[PDB]
């Protein structure tokens, strides 16, 4: 049974609600982004209208085989009427094709559903500037002040400088980057660009990337692993055992691995600056965990909510414990008392 925080009142709509069977009253199912916790339950046998971005709809058609007649792609930043209700999709600054959804209810209520997002001051000049929001369905993944991490640009600067140094010292080093979903593509694309290489990967991963409308992608990626000095591997293989095994397969072309694991936040963020990050090393293998987030930090979240001034907040993450819920509610009230709304 579908939980309340996935339903949009006053409509026939649900958000990210595909794992509950046929939801009573639902005439259109919205999908914010192509991450498995959110698409859980979609497959080629789905027969109700799915509304989403163009990129999400490429992934549904080619990776999940959803039939074309049930996929309804909407342009961004454009007022659209769906089953008699005005909606807008906005870029969520999450993974490729991820959106926030603005719903203009027939009674005058305005609802923003963030999906998953990384709040940014650029959102203060989208179509959100123009009107009041009554209800905010909020991605609360990192809603506590201990959750700090650097900008994506500082993280990428670290990665490119680390990779370029290592490979200039040893031209026979291979770089490997872990992946298990879409998102975070700038990590491996920025490192390959500084090294003058295409990125090499499995046919399954190449297929996924080919759905993402990235400019000039054919110039940036390949399935010919032998021609590439930046490889992608599943995240589960980014360990000393799995990397040893990979280095054997490369036919003595390489004699060292430098590997990256983009994580979200880890507790080493509560002590160490990005500049001071060091790898774990065993012989000719080194592994860097880098804090590349596609979710809001606490400060970024707070800034966004204090600017938007919603009347009511409904969290969509960390909802399963009373301690989490109470924590989140306390910070919402602080934010409102501090800013005066
Ligand atoms: Ni996500």
Swiss-Prot record:
Record-level GO cellular component terms: fibrillar center; nucleoplasm
Any GO BP: cell division
Keywords: Cell cycle, Cell division, DNA damage, DNA repair, Hydrolase, Isopeptide bond, Metal-binding, Mitosis, Nucleus, Phosphoprotein, Ubl conjugation, Zinc, Zinc-finger
Top-rank taxon, per record: Eukaryota
Induction: During mitosis. The mRNA encoding this protein contains an internal ribosome entry site (IRES) in its 5'-UTR. This 5'-UTR generally suppresses translation while specifically promoting expression during mitosis, when cap-dependent translation may be impaired.
Tissue specificity comment: Expressed in brain, heart, kidney, liver, pancreas, placenta and skeletal muscle.
Membrane-spanning intervals of the chain: none
Subcellular location: Nucleus
A molecular function GO annotation: 5'-3' DNA exonuclease activity
Function (record text): May be required for DNA interstrand cross-link repair. Also required for checkpoint mediated cell cycle arrest in early prophase in response to mitotic spindle poisons. Possesses beta-lactamase activity, catalyzing the hydrolysis of penicillin G and nitrocefin. Exhibits no activity towards other beta-lactam antibiotic classes including cephalosporins (cefotaxime) and carbapenems (imipenem).
Family: Belongs to the DNA repair metallo-beta-lactamase (DRMBL) family.
Subunit organization: Binds constitutively to TP53BP1. Binds CDC27, which is itself a component of the anaphase promoting complex (APC). Binds PIAS1.
Protein name: DNA cross-link repair 1A protein
Species this protein is from: Homo sapiens (Human)
Residues of the full protein shown: 700 to 1040 of 1040
